[PDB]
Design a binder for these strands. Structure first.
Lengths: 122, 151, 37, 136
RNA sequence: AGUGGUAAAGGAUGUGGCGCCGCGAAGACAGCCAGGAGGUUGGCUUAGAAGCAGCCAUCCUUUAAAGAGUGCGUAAUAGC
RNA sequence: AAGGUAGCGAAAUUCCUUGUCGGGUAAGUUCCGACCUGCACGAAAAGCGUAACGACCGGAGCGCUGUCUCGGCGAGGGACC
RNA sequence: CUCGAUGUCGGCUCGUCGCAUCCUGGGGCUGAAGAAGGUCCCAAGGGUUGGGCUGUUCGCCCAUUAAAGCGGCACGCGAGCUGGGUUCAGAACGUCGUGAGACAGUUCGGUCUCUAUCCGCCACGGGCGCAGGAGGCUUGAGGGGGGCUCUUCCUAGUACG
RNA sequence: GCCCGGAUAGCUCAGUCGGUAGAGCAGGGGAUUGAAAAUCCCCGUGUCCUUGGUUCGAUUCCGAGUCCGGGCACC
C-alpha cells in the first residue's frame, strides 16, 4: 500500500519501470507513498539508452495493493505497484506508458494527460 | 529617468562636439560589486564569514569562477574574497555543542535588475537557462593592469 | 528601538520620557524609539 | 605601555592610598577608587584623548606601566614557581592626579576624558587647577 | 519601588535635601498676538545662497532690536 | 658499521585523517582500487604473492523473512483466587 | 561527603523543567513600496521528520520541512534493557625497551545478577466516618486531558508599483 | 578554534635597534656573431595588501582586515 524506501514500478520514459523513493511529498511527516500521491525517488532499475538516467525525480502514485477505497465506496486493488515519473511542474515524464483508468487517479486530477494517456486493457 | 518622471518624460540627445571626458568620472556606481577569487562552489562556511559586508548573489554549493560577481559590497570599494570552504571538516573530537550558521538566499534576479548594476566592465554573461555577471577583467591583478590611472 | 541601557537622547531635541520606571525616550523620528526599561 | 628595562620579575599585592594631586596643565583626570590599571587600558585612554583632540596638540601623562601581573600558567593546576610575566600596569588607588593636556579649551577635553576613563577602569572624577601649590 | 526580601559598569526634565544660580513690578518663564525690518543680494558657486548648498567672513546704518540669519529645503529663490 | 635492495604502502603499523583522487552511494570517516611527503613498513620473530580450505574479521549486492515503520489477535507456562 | 564501595561512554525506552524561542505569534524599525528579508522587547503553546557513514552525542551529506532550537536533571535514566565502547589475562603488528614488559597507536574476541521491605507512582478493593435508618439523581470549589501546522484555493497579482 | 605565516614591479622573492626600496626572469636599447645562442652593461615598471594608532615622517614599530601560517582536541 505504501512505503518510504521503495522499489516501486513506473512505465513512463523510465530508465526501468523501477525506482526507489525516499518518501512522501505531502505534509512533512511522510510514511506513505500512498495511492494518488506525489513523492521522491531515484532509479533502481537499468535503462537501455533513454534520456532518463540513474537520477531522481518526484512524481505521482499509481496502483498499490492494500485497498484503493474510494469516496463512492468504489473499491479495488491491483497486484501491482507503480506511478508515473514527473518532470518539475508535475508534467509527466514520457510520451506514453503501459497501464489504465480509474477514479483515484484523474480524481487527484493534476495530470489529466496521464489521464487520457493510459487508457486501454493494461 | 522613467522612474523619476514616471513615463511622462522624454528626452534624447546626440552630441555638440568631441570633448575629452573632462576630469571627473560619470560613474562608476555606488556599493562596489563583490567578485570571486576562483572557480569552485559556494561554501556555507565561506559565504558565512563576510556576509554582513553587504548582499550576496549566488548560493551553495554554487561554484562560480574568477571575475564573476557574487554580491555587492557595503561600500564603494571592490574586493575579491573566496571560500568553498566553508572549511573545515571535521571530527573527532568531539561534541556536542554547537552553532549552526544559516544564510540568506538571493537577492537573486532580475536582469532586469542585475544588468544596470554594472558600470565599468561587468558583461552580464547570460545563458539559455542562467544569467551571470563578471567584470571586464576576471583576474584581480589583471584589473589593476588597466588601472593604472594617472598621469 | 530598545536597549537595556545607553540612551543619551539624540534627534537633537529627543525627549526624555518618564513612563513606568520605563526610561523611554520619545521623539519625532522612529529612529529614536528609545525603550530602556 | 612602558615599564621598559625593568630590573626584577614580580611585585606582590595590597593597595590603600598614595600621593597624586596637583595639576600640571589644567586638563585633569583623577582616579578615585581604583588600584592597578592596565598599562594597555591606559594607552587606551591615551588614544581616546589624542584622537579626540583634533588629533595633534599633545596631552601629558600621569601614572606608569609600573608592575608585572602574572596569571602564571595558562590555565593548568597551581604550583609553578608562580613564574611567568604577562600584564604590566599602574598602581594608583586614592583618587590620583592623572594629568592630560592638549589645548582643547573645553568640555571638549571633558568628553575626551569622559570616554577615556568612563572606559578605563573605575569610579573616578575630573577637573582643573583648584588650590595651586607652593614648593621650595 | 514593595528596596525590605543580596550585585557591579553604568544610565537617566526618580523622591526628597542642600549649600547655591534667573526675578529689569525699567511685573517674570511653557502657554499668547503680530512684525518677523531696509544695505543685508559674492567670496568661490552664481545651475543657487540673494541667512535655510562647501573654504572664512564677525561690519553699518536701522528699531518691534537689530540673528557674522540655530532650524523644514529645492533651482537659485520663494514660504515656515 | 654501513647506511636498507627486491617487492611493499594511508594497511590485524598514516596521528595531520572523515589525507587526496577514483568506485561503490540519494547520500559513506565503511571497504576495493589507485597515489605514495611511509607520524613509526623491509625478508627470516621472514618480504611480495599464492588455489584450496575458517563456526576467521571486515566491505558489497540478489533472495527471503513481524525484523524495522508501534506491530495486532492467537496458544501453551508462571504470574493471580 | 565517598575507596566496608557512587556503574564512567554511545544508545535505547518513558522523559521532566528551562529560555538567552527555532516554527510558532504580538510587535515598534529599516537603508520598510509589495513581496520578501533582515534589527531588538514581549510571550513557552503545541510543535520542534527519514536515512547515510561514523560504537562516536558533534559532525559532514541525501530528501524534504512551517520549523527541522541551546540546555538543565551525576553530561536523567542497570534495582528498566542495551552494552560497539574506552579499561583484567589472550594474540596481532606498527613503536620503546639490552628484555623482562610496555604505547590515552591500533586492531580480532572479551562470563552485567537482580524473589520489593519502606516513602514514591498505577490500579483495584477492605474501614470508618462527613450524630435518624434508608434506594437513587445531582452540583461542583479543586484537580486532570487536548490546545500544532502545512500547501493549495477563495479577495490575488487593484496595496508598492 | 586558539596558535604562528606570507602579502613588495609583468610572475617567483629580501630590508640600520624606521628615514633608501631590490636582484632574478619577462624586457626593449646595445657590446658581441658571419647571423644566432650564451654572456656583459644599460631602461622601464613600485598599492611595499585595507584600516585605525607611535614619530617630524612608517613598506618597516604597533591595531584591524588580507589570501596566508604550522598546530589544540574520550565520556
Amino acid at each position: 500500500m505504501i512505503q518510504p524506501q521503495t522499489y516501486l514500478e513506473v512505465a513512463d520514459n523510465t530508465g526501468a519501470r523501477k525506482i526507489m523513493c525516499i518518501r512522501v511529498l505531502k505534509g512533512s511527516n511522510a510514511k506513505y507513498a500512498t495511492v494518488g500521491d506525489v513523492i521522491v525517488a531515484s532509479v533502481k532499475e537499468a535503462i537501455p539508452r533513454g534520456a532518463v538516467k540513474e537520477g531522481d525525480v518526484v512524481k505521482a502514485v499509481v496502483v498499490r495493493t492494500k485497498k484503493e477505497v474510494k469516496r463512492p465506496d468504489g473499491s479495488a486493488i491491483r497486484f501491482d505497484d507503480n506511478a508515473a515519473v514527473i518532470i518539475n511542474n508535475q508534467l509527466e515524464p514520457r510520451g506514453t506508458r503501459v497501464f489504465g483508468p480509474v477514479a483515484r487517479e484523474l480524481r487527484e486530477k493534476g495530470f489529466m494527460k496521464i489521464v487520457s494517456l493510459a487508457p486501454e486493457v493494461l | 529617468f522613467m522612474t523619476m518622471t514616471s513615463g511622462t518624460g522624454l528626452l534624447y540627445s546626440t552630441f555638440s562636439h568631441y570633448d575629452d571626458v573632462r576630469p571627473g568620472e560619470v560613474g562608476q556606481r555606488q556599493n562596489g560589486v563583490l567578485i570571486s577569487n576562483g572557480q569552485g562552489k559556494a561554501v556555507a562556511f565561506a559565504l558565512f564569514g563576510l556576509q554582513d559586508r553587504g548582499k550576496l548573489f549566488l548560493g551553495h554549493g554554487a561554484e562560480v569562477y574568477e571575475g564573476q560577481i557574487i554580491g555587492i559590497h557595503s561600500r564603494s570599494n571592490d574586493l575579491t574574497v573566496n571560500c568553498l570552504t566553508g572549511k573545515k571538516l571535521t571530527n573527532m573530537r568531539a561534541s556536542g555543542a554547537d552553532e549552526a550558521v544559516v544564510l540568506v538566499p538571493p537577492i537573486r534576479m532580475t536582469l532586469e535588475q542585475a544588468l544596470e548594476f554594472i558600470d565599468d566592465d561587468e558583461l552580464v554573461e547570460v545563458t539559455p537557462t542562467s544569467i551571470r555577471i563578471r567584470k571586464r577583467h576576471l583576474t584581480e591583478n589583471d584589473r589593476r593592469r588597466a588601472n593604472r590611472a594617472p598621469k | 528601538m530598545k536597549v537595556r541601557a545607553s540612551v543619551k537622547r539624540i534627534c537633537d531635541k529627543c525627549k526624555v520620557i518618564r513612563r513606568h520606571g520605563r526610561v523611554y525616550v520619545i521623539c519625532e523620528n522612529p529612529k529614536h524609539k528609545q525603550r530602556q526599561g | 605601555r612602558m615599564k621598559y628595562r625593568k630590573q626584577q620579575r614580580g611585585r606582590l599585592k595590597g593597595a590603600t592610598k598614595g600621593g597624586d594631586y596637583v595639576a600640571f596643565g589644567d586638563y585633569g583626570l583623577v582616579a578615585l577608587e581604583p588600584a592597578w590599571i592596565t598599562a594597555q587600558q591606559i594607552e587606551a585612554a591615551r588614544v581616546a584623548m589624542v584622537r579626540h583632540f583634533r588629533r595633534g596638540g599633545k596631552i601629558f601623562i600621569r601614572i606608569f606601566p609600573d608592575k608585572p601581573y602574572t596569571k602564571k600558567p595558562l590555565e593548568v593546576r597551581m604550583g609553578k614557581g608562580k613564574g611567568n610575566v604577562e600584564g604590566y600596569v599602574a598602581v594608583v588607588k586614592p583618587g590620583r592626579v592623572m594629568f592630560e593636556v592638549a589645548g582643547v579649551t573645553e568640555e571638549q577635553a571633558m568628553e575626551a576624558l569622559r570616554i577615556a576613563g568612563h572606559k578605563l577602569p573605575i569610579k573616578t572624577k575630573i577637573v582643573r587647577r583648584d588650590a595651586y601649590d607652593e614648593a621650595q
